[PDB]
Design a protein around this ligand. Structure first.
Ligand SMILES: C[NH+](C)c1cc(NC(=O)CNC(C)(C)C)c(O)c2c1C[C@H]1C[C@H]3[C@H]([NH+](C)C)C(O)=C(C(N)=O)C(=O)[C@@]3(O)C(O)=C1C2=O
Ligand SMILES: [Mg+2]
Ligand SMILES: [Mg+2]
Ligand SMILES: [Mg+2]
Ligand SMILES: [Mg+2]
Ligand SMILES: [Mg+2]
Ligand SMILES: [Mg+2]
Ligand SMILES: [Mg+2]
Lengths: 67, 101, 37, 122, 304, 132, 584, 105, 192
RNA sequence: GGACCUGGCGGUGCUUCAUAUCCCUCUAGAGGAGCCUGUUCUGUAAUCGAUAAACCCCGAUCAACCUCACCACCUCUUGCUCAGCCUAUAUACCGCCAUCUUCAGCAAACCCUGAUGAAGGCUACAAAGUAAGCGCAAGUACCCACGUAAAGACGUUAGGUCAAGGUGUAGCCCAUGAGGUGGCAAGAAAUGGGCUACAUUUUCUACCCCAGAAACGAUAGCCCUUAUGAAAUAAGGGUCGAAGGUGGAUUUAG
């Protein structure tokens, strides 16, 4: 049921452990709490991969820097 | 070459909602998280209220896949009542019998 | 999408590889309707 | 008959259980006799089981405009038959699976296979 | 007919091919061999057994075509031809003649079976007259030729027996004798194990009957078979029970208990308690709601 | 009265086959199913597009095999081999038959992206089960 | 490949070929309409992705004048478009790189300044099956000329070669190969001399092309061309390029063109192959087989090397290397048919059954020739039980037999005196479509009415002959309006009388009178016997009148027999006397 | 839509309303007229598309055949008059039907 | 038409050679006058040569016992045998402790994408892990919602990552880090 | 006008029956109160279809926008479409049903009777009827052969739907077609069907039937919070403590 579909050799840490793309702010902040929430959500996504996970993360980074 | 203008309007809804799904997802998460300040949510309220009123999944009507009929559709084949009756009565649909229990 | 479907059947019929009686009906009926109307 | 015994020890499948779902008990038990005889001449251990059938019943109107009091009711018979394999090899497993999925029946067949590879902890 | 002949030849070659086809190159391939073979090769799955595949000989497949009743001169063969019911009227004449010369000297067939034997369509009153004439032949004291005539016309009865199936006594556990029976009533199942002695002790689902059955009606339901058979404080039952409600469970326990006390009681008494109505499953189960109704048989409002 | 798939008795002169003759309440008691695909059981996802491709296939084969299909096809579906098994008549020439078989073979393999196989079966005349 | 319906069966090899070409026609039907309309099919549903189910785009998507567009239309095989925009690059002044100028001249040399043919080439094998026994030399002269592109002077390839600045080995090799392919042999040799002057290296393909060009040159002796081939291989060794199987197979094809004088050179070539260590292929053996087999050779030691070849070649499994392995099997059992050797035919068939040599059989025409001559040999010198076993094993599973094969079946069955098998093979021939074969009809009828038979064989022959006559009647209005043969009519009549269908014999004697064909004396005597059985003086007088009208010299004996054997009235006596007076 | 197209017999039933015409077509004719080697012309093996003047000449032949077949629908049949036109009293039915007992009138 | 191979065909003929593949009915190829259908009142079941019901039957005319015998004469090459791991469940548990659920769901159509088919779940025995005392106390206190009492089976679920092999990786990673955090003594264990 | 034939009718006769229908009977309701939801009427700039049995929680297994075909305003012309139209006709239709049907008849092809009229065809101790085919029946599904399902032909009511879709006829194409934005679904009243009650076999609590206590009733109104949604209908809590005293004629269901 998984013929092809390598997902560039993601291998289980890029999908759920998003510290390396989290790029820690002051972790006591509500922004960092939102990052924890969205990180847990993107970890629990099985339908999305690491590339769209990190473009979601970067979209939030861009919007938060805009504000 | 669609069944009717209502079906074509619905497929416009589907295609461009599927395009404009991600931004709405980010900003309605920004609605219903209770961490951010209220005005910092109000600017987000402005952005979704400006996001067009054809991509929100509130206009998506599951019509019949062969012939446009809003009410009376079985989801498992996207078929209307009498079209599903027609096909599963002529017998081109596997496993559907007449329920006699 | 219905466009690939309907326009492919359209192209195949006017290539002559497809014969659909509904379009035959509309052709004959519109021929008579332009004859008299 | 290319073989190519390559490098690494067996994946050690215990209980590869095949749930065969069908609309048709005749297809299910003919396939049962097929799989049982194939497993018997293979030498692997086969056991039979019959999970109970599920009937998906639902109701539609009969006329197009009025007359709700006269409805039609349609049903689906989803019968399940279980062929559990215990004590079969990984190579025997995927060759037996390959054979039975070549000769899997049509739309009246699904082959839900449950594989328990054992391994060592780490 | 040549159609029948070439069909018979085709069936012979086909059954030879069928046995060689499956595994059975030896010449003896029986009809039930043929049926199981075609059942495996073509998965039937149609609710009508006549809509299933069939591989029989053309005698059974094709109906009985009556032979030509006249040769190439006109002149039909049987002398009672122009009646149009030649076999039936010949049978009347023959039975009448045996009655006549018997008087000078001194279950039953169904209409469908008689029509099959005569290969002629018959009327109901015609069949009644035939049965009446054969009754007259039996009532008159007749000889052995007439007896074998009547016995060729008469068929079997296939009587059943209503003696209740006695379960074997299982001398097991440590040294005790028990019987393990089953009961079902209204989606409830009860497997009961009664030991012959024990002075009366009930173990429904690990607890006693005063705990699992706080209702005196349920206690009377468990009472009922002991009190009919006058063996009240003599036995002990342990029950496992699944599903249903309080009275369905009580009735299922009563049924399984009675169907093991059958093994623990004499044959005259078990016939008597079947007559009392303790060994028969109650088929009264819930019906189905219907589309356009308000229940199983209850309908909606104003209809007339 | 019920007339879902019941052909009505005209005068006793109407050729009809088993499938058109039998009523929809004999759909699994006497008839069977004309398309065998796995979408309609307990656990499956894509049955809707299975059905839409089924009706596409029926109308397409009828439009491209004009006036030679005796009764309706058998649309079997196993793995990724589609089977269109046909009861086609013996009127048009076998060169035309093979031409349309290859044409349909290739286009349907190409439109549904799998192995698609058409298996013809030639019949002299449209078969009559009973005269109604 | 064919279907399983009895109406859709091919009956003959021509019908099978027509069915197959119609199927390939429909295949490229869908290919054409699909590549014309790729938009309707861009939606992929299968996973994983199938690029050979994805559309092939034949239009150039790159429109600006660029080297990427040059590589694009070179890959798309658009010769005129590539030439025109290479010109456009030249007037634009963009320096076009060496590799893509090479690729452009590669396309030009491969296609001869023309587009690729829109039809996938399956033609030029449409010879009729009624001329397979005469004039193979003129057949060679009118069938060895494929209408390819002759190398025209001042073409686009030569223009690009003159225009491009820095000539190299790849371009020189390409244009020598292209000149050889388009029959500019002398120009290719001159360009090779220019290569040697310019100090470049020519590769294996170019050297094989040069060998072919030297051989295809006109007005030179085989000795001179052999010395030239030796000089070219010495140049190969001096340029340190290693020759191979295709090189020596081109050499073997050339000496096959060079006939009787090149047999010992062919042996030297194969010995040098085994000395160097490159495995000779089936097509190597094909070239030496067809060299040593020539009509008019009275020695056949050139046919004993075939036993040498198989003595090398038993028990081996092969892989595809060289296109003439199907021709190897066809030619080697062409030797078998020429030599009439059952043991070698069986040994080649065993080599065939070893492994994928059944794949090495090749095309349908070669397969039909293969099994046709094999079964001709089987019927010629095998015993009848194993000929019938090979008949049921090969026909029609392997091939569709021919009418010459049919008459050879009849000859074999007549030699074996197993005339009870004639109706079965007759029904098989009518099944395969030999109904309108008059030679087959004449052969079956003469072998069929030659002798007196047991009555069940007689009535089976009566049914077969009645159906033959039904076909003869049911051939209406064709340009080959074959008149009723006298021998066929006489044999049909004799069979009808022997089976006892006298009335149909009489009405086809009416057909004798209708078609003005002279009847046979044995037939007239059998008619005398049938008239004796039926006691019919009128029928006897009718057939005696037929004999008198055809003026046969047995009519006096027929009249004397009728007088001796029938009680005849005076007016019939007078009529018979008048007929005898007219014949006298 | 192609999906909501229907069948010839059903459309004739719906149009005629009797319960209360494609025979003049070859298998491969289209308005583009890309004549195949399997369809129309027999099986040289060369795919081609015929020219314009051939397209309109072929369809003009088809439409004059249409008009001729409309005419062969619309002849007038000649019925002999029995005692008057539109009557039945002198109309000659044919010979009596041949008897199944080897009898003919 | 032609007289068919049904009556051209004679006894002792190889049937794996006749029908290699799963194919629809083809009555001319079938040497059997098989009759379908509910018969008419004064008639017989409908004949063989044209039955769409014969066609619609899933047609297990490509598989008989002697064919499957010969098929697995060919297919007998593709197998090893087992060691003496024994039929004893406790013996095979001792030899190989952990147990893992990793499945496939075979559909039939254009695509083989059943996402739920990546479900993976690991069951391991503490009595086979053999190295847990206050570590097993800490273990249970970590995984409260699993570890039913009546059998010593630990069942950890993964359906969070799209691929089956990295689901297996999540199972083994969770096992080893739950083990390591159980053996990591924390400073607030005593104030329980 | 006279005499008939066939059918329908009869507050038409005799006889035998109906059994949840015909009555006497048996149980539980409606009709009386509140609420929900359709319909009529009124209203609005604001769809349409059903309308005794066989309409009235009906198309809808379902309208905040969407749905939507309604209205208001403003825009589009080869308009997603070799356009389209939810424009008119269910009295042109196919398609999909209701009703008799909680029936058993409809009948090709013949033969006979009636001076060869419409028409009719019955007597088993038998006087002209024989009958292919549909239907009942039979065979299937569910737990049995019981029961419930399914099934019930020809025809009836021009019975329902051009609005599920297709479609003939007539019409439009500056329109009656297409798109965008915003509103339409309120009761001086009435009526159909449901839900909850008017409590003592009741109410609250634990238990899920061996107690303690009382000695009533909105799923309505208002407020708060939550769910889902761009934008509240639904859910919970708070608040409140209606009318209501087991309902006549008539009627429903078993
Ligand atoms: C006026 N009448 C003579 C009539 C006429 C037509 N149609 C036409 O004549 C129109 N014809 C044109 C369009 C001009 C070509 C009609 O179409 C109708 C009717 C009658 C109705 C009566 C309907 C009524 N319903 C609404 C309750 C009724 O009492 C019944 C019934 N059985 O209950 C009906 O029969 C009725 O529904 C009905 O069918 C009518 C018409 O169809
Ligand atoms: Mg009904
Ligand atoms: Mg007139
Ligand atoms: Mg409008
Ligand atoms: Mg009406
Ligand atoms: Mg109306
Ligand atoms: Mg019903
Ligand atoms: Mg019935």
């Amino acid at each position: 049921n998984e013929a092809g579909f390598d997902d560039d050799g993601s291998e289980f840490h890029e999908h759920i452990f998003l510290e390396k793309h989290l790029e820690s702010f002051p972790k006591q902040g509500p922004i960092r709490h939102f990052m924890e929430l969205v990180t847990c959500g993107l970890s629990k996504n099985p339908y999305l991969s690491v590339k769209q996970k990190v473009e979601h993360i970067e979209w939030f980074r861009n919007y938060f820097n805009e504000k | 070459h669609y069944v009717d203008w209502r079906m074509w309007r619905d497929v416009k809804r589907r295609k461009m909602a599927y395009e404009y799904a991600d931004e709405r997802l980010r900003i309605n998460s920004l609605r219903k998280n209770t961490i951010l300040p209220k005005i910092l949510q109000d600017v987000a309220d402005e952005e979704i209220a400006a996001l067009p009123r054809d991509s929100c999944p509130v206009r998506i009507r599951n019509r019949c896949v062969m012939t446009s009929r809003p009410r009376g559709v079985k989801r498992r084949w996207r078929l209307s009542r009498i079209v599903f009756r027609h096909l599963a009565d002529h017998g081109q649909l596997s496993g559907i019998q007449r329920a006699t229990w | 999408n219905h466009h690939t479907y309907a326009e492919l059947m359209q192209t195949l019929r006017f290539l002559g590889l497809y014969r659909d009686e509904h379009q035959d009906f509309m052709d004959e009926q519109k021929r008579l309707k332009k004859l008299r109307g | 008959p290319v073989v190519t015994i390559s490098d690494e020890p067996d994946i050690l499948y215990k209980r590869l259980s095949v749930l065969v779902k069908g609309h048709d008990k005749a297809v299910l038990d003919s396939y049962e006799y097929f799989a049982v005889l194939a497993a018997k001449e293979l030498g692997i251990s086969i056991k039979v089981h019959e999970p109970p059938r599920k009937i998906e019943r639902f109701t539609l109107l009969q006329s197009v405009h009025i007359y709700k009091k006269h409805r039609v009711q349609y049903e689906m018979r989803t019968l399940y038959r279980c062929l559990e394999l215990e004590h079969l090899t990984g190579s025997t497993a995927d060759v037996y699976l390959e054979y039975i999925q070549r000769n899997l029946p049509e739309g009246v067949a699904m082959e839900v296979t449950k594989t328990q590879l054992e391994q060592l902890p780490e | 007919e040549d159609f029948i002949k070439k069909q018979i030849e085709e069936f012979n070659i086909g059954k030879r091919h069928l046995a060689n086809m499956m595994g059975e190159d030896p010449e003896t391939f029986t009809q039930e061999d043929i049926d199981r073979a075609i059942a495996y090769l073509f998965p039937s799955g149609l609710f009508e057994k006549r809509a299933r595949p069939v591989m029989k000989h053309p005698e059974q497949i094709f109906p009985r075509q009556r032979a030509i009743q006249w040769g190439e001169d006109g002149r039909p063969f049987h002398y009672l031809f122009y009646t149009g019911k030649q076999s039936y009227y010949s049978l009347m004449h023959d039975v009448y003649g045996m009655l006549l010369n018997l008087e000078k000297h001194q279950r039953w067939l169904i209409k469908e079976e008689l029509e099959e034997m005569l290969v002629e369509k018959l009327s109901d009153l015609d069949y009644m007259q035939f049965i009446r004439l054969l009754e007259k032949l039996l009532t008159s004291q007749c000889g052995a030729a007439e007896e074998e005539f009547v016995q060729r016309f008469r068929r079997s009865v296939t009587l059943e027996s209503k003696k209740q199936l006695i379960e074997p006594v299982q001398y097991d556990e440590q040294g005790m004798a028990f019987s393990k029976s089953e009961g079902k009533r209204k989606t409830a199942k009860a497997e009961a194990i009664v030991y012959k002695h024990g002075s009366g002790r009930i173990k429904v689902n690990g607890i006693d009957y005063q705990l699992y059955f706080p209702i005196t009606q349920d206690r009377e339901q468990l009472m009922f078979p002991f009190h009919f058979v006058d063996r009240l404080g003599k036995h002990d039952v342990t029950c496992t029970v699944s599903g249903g409600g309080r009275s369905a469970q009580a009735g299922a326990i009563r049924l399984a208990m009675a169907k093991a006390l059958c093994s623990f009681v004499t044959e005259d008494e078990v016939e008597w308690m079947r007559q009392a109505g303790l060994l028969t499953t109650d088929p009264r189960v819930r019906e189905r709601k219907k589309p356009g109704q308000e229940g199983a048989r209850r309908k909606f409002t104003w209809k007339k | 009265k019920n007339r879902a798939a019941r052909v009505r008795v005209s005068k006793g002169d109407k050729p009809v086959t088993y499938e058109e003759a039998h009523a929809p309440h004999y759909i699994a008691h006497r008839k069977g199913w004309l398309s065998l695909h796995t979408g309609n059981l307990d656990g499956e996802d894509h049955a809707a597009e299975r059905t839409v491709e089924d009706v596409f296939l029926r109308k397409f084969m009828w439009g491209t095999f004009p006036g030679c299909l005796a009764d309706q096809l058998v649309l079997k579906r196993r793995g990724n081999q589609l089977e269109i098994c046909a009861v086609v008549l013996r009127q048009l020439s076998p060169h035309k038959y093979y031409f349309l078989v290859g044409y349909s073979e290739t286009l349907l393999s190409y439109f549904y992206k799998c192995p698609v196989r058409l298996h013809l079966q030639t019949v002299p005349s449209k078969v009559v089960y009973k005269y109604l | 490949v064919f279907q399983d319906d009895p109406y859709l069966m091919p009956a003959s090899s021509l019908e099978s070929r027509s069915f197959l070409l119609a199927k390939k026609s429909g295949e490229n039907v869908a290919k054409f309409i699909i590549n014309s309309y790729p938009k309707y099919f861009q939606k992929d549903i299968a996973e994983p992705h199938i690029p050979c189910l994805m559309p092939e785009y034949f239009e150039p998507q790159i429109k600006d004048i660029s080297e990427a567009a040059l590589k694009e239309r070179i890959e798309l095989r658009k010769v005129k478009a590539s030439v025109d925009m290479f010109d456009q690059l030249l007037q634009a002044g963009t320096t076009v790189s060496l590799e893509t100028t090479n690729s452009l001249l590669d396309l030009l040399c491969y296609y001869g300044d023309q587009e690729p043919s829109t039809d996938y080439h399956f033609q030029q094998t449409g010879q009729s099956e009624a001329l397979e026994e005469e004039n193979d030399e003129t057949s060679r002269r009118k069938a060895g000329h494929q209408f390819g592109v002759t190398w025209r002077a001042k073409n686009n390839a030569e223009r690009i070669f003159s225009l491009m600045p820095e000539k190299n080995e790849h371009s020189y090799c390409t244009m020598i190969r292209g000149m050889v392919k388009h029959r500019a042999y002398e120009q290719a040799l001159n360009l090779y001399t220019e290569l040697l002057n310019n100090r470049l290296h020519a590769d294996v393909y170019t050297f094989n092309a040069l060998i072919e060009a030297t051989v295809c040159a006109i007005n030179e002796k085989f000795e001179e061309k052999w010395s030239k081939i030796l000089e070219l291989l010495r140049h190969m060794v001096a340029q340190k390029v290693k020759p191979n199987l295709q090189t020596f197979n081109t050499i073997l094809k050339c000496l096959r063109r060079f006939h009787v004088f090149a047999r010992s050179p062919a042996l030297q070539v194969l010995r040098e192959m085994k000395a160097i260590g490159i495995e000779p292929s089936l097509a190597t053996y094909h070239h030496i087989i067809r060299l040593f087999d020539q009509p008019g050779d009275p020695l056949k030691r050139s046919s004993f090397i075939i036993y040498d070849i198989m003595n090398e070649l038993m028990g081996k499994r092969f892989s595809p290397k060289d296109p003439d392995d199907d021709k190897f099997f066809q030619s080697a059992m062409s030797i078998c048919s020429s030599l009439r050797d059952l043991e070698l035919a069986y040994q080649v068939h065993g080599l065939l059954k070893t492994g994928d040599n059944w794949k090495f059989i090749g095309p349908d025409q070669h397969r039909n020739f293969y099994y046709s001559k094999f079964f001709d040999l089987i019927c010629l010198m095998e015993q009848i039980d194993v000929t019938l076993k090979w008949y049921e094993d090969l026909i029609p599973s392997a091939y569709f037999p021919h009418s010459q094969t049919m008459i050879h079946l009849l000859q074999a069955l007549d030699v074996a005196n197993r005339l009870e098998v004639i109706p079965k093979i007759w029904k098989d021939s009518k099944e395969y479509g030999h109904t309108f074969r008059s030679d087959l009809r004449e052969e079956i009828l003469m072998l069929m009415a030659r002798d007196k038979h047991p009555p069940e064989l007689q009535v089976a022959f009566a049914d077969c002959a009645a159906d033959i006559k039904s076909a003869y009647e049911s051939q209406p209005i064709r340009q080959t309006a074959q008149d009723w043969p006298a021998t066929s009519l006489n044999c049909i009549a004799i069979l009808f009388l022997r089976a006892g269908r006298t009335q149909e014999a009489w009405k086809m004697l009416g057909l004798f009178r209708k078609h003005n064909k002279i009847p046979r004396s044995e037939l007239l005597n059998e008619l005398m016997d049938s008239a004796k059985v039926s006691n019919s003086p009128s029928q006897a007088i009718e057939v005696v009148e037929l004999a008198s009208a055809f003026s046969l010299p047995i009519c006096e004996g027929l009249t004397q027999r009728v007088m001796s054997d029938f009680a005849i009235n005076q007016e019939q006596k007078e009529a018979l006397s008048n007929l005898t007076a007219l014949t006298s | 839509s192609f999906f909501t197209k229907l069948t010839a017999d059903e459309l004739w039933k719906g149009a005629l309303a009797e319960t209360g015409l494609n025979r003049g077509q070859i298998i491969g004719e289209g308005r583009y007229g890309f004549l195949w080697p399997g369809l129309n012309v027999p099986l040289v093996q060369t795919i081609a598309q015929r020219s314009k003047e051939e397209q309109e000449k072929v369809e003009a032949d088809m439409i004059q055949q249409r008009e001729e077949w409309d005419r062969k629908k619309k002849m007038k049949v000649k019925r002999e008059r029995g005692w008057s036109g539109n009557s039945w009293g002198g109309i000659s039915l044919g010979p009596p039907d041949p008897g199944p007992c080897g009898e003919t009138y | 038409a032609l007289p068919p191979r049904t009556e051209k065909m004679a006894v002792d003929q190889d049937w794996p050679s006749v029908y290699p593949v799963a194919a629809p009915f083809k009555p001319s190829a079938v040497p059997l006058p098989v009759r379908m259908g509910y018969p008419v009142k004064k008639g017989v079941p409908m004949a063989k040569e044209g039955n769409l019901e014969l066609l619609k039957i899933p047609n297990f005319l490509h598989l008989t016992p002697v064919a499957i015998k010969k098929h697995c004469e060919a297919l007998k090459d593709f197998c090893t045998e087992w060691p003496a791991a024994l039929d004893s469940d406790e013996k095979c548990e001792k030899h190989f402790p952990i147990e893992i659920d990793s499945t496939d769901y075979v559909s039939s159509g254009p695509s083989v994408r059943n996402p739920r088919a990546r479900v993976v779940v690991l069951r391991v025995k503490l009595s086979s892990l053999n190295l847990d005392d206050h570590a097993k106390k800490k273990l249970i206190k970590l995984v409260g919602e699993r570890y039913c009492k009546t059998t010593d089976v630990l069942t950890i679920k993964t359906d969070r990552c799209p691929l089956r092999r990295q689901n297996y990786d999540y199972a083994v990673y969770l096992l080893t880090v739950l083990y390591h955090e159980s053996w990591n003594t924390e400073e607030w264990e005593k104030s329980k």
